[PDB]
Amino acid sequence: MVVKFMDVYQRSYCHPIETLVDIFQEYPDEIEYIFKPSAVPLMRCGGACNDEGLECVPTEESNITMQIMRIKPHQGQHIGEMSFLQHNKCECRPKK
Amino acid sequence: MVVKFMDVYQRSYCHPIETLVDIFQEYPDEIEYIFKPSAVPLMRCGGACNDEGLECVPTEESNITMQIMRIKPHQGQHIGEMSFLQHNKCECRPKK
To answer: B74 in the Ramachandran plot: left (φ > 0), alpha (ψ -120 to 50) or beta?
Structure first.
């Protein structure tokens, strides 16, 4: 079959999407660590907007705490809680 | 609460993930066109593997056809069918 355009557009439109997010990218100051897993799944805004003058951005957010394996040379592996930001609501906004 | 490590790793482990994929990326030979929506959601392999000599790749795939709006600046627009690859099964394999 074929997905009809209106259906394709609505499902591709700006909304919260579970996304794999690199841990080190979120915690840029932890330069001595390697994390396992290296990326975790987090709800993040993504998708289209009606006119190019707009971008998909969060209008509501919250945090989630996860146990992450933190590995630094000579310190063996540690399992530690790390907090990550999630997007609960998304809307199209003018590119500032 | 806190998501326990075993669950964190399991949810982060190589598997098919609904991913927003840039159409022009899947069809880089379609220069003249602006697609709308510019990206669509497709199931794509993503996630961690146990050791770094491995990468998450598809081991079963399929196709999905969607009606996409094709725009040629100052030339009008057409709604047309476009085929996209989908990943149905993923596995961690050597980075040959």
So the answer is: left
**E strands present in chain A:** 2-3, 15-22, 34-36, 39-46, 54-71, 77-94
Please check whether residue A21 touches B, CB under 8 A: no
Q: Under an 8 A CB cutoff, do A69 and B2 touch?
A: no
Residue B18 contacts A, CB cutoff 8 Å: yes
* Cross-chain CB nearest to A37 (options B8, B65, B79): B8
Partner-chain contact B66 A37, CB within 8 Å: no
Q: How was this structure determined?
A: X-ray
- Residue B66 and residue B63: Cα distance in Å, rounded? 10
The reported resolution of this PDB entry, expressed in Å, is 2.1
Domain ranges, residue B29: 1-96
CATH number of B71's domain: 2.10.90.10
Closest approach of chain A CAs to the CA of B30, in angstroms? 19
The total of other beta-carbon atoms located within 10 Å of residue A50's CB is 11
- Cβ contact (<8 Å) for B67 and A41? no
How much is the CA Rg of chain B, to the nearest whole Å? Answer: 17
Q: What residue of B is the nearest CA neighbor of A67? A: B5
Residues 6+ apart with CB under 8 A from B11: A40, A41, B3
Tally of domains in chain A:
1
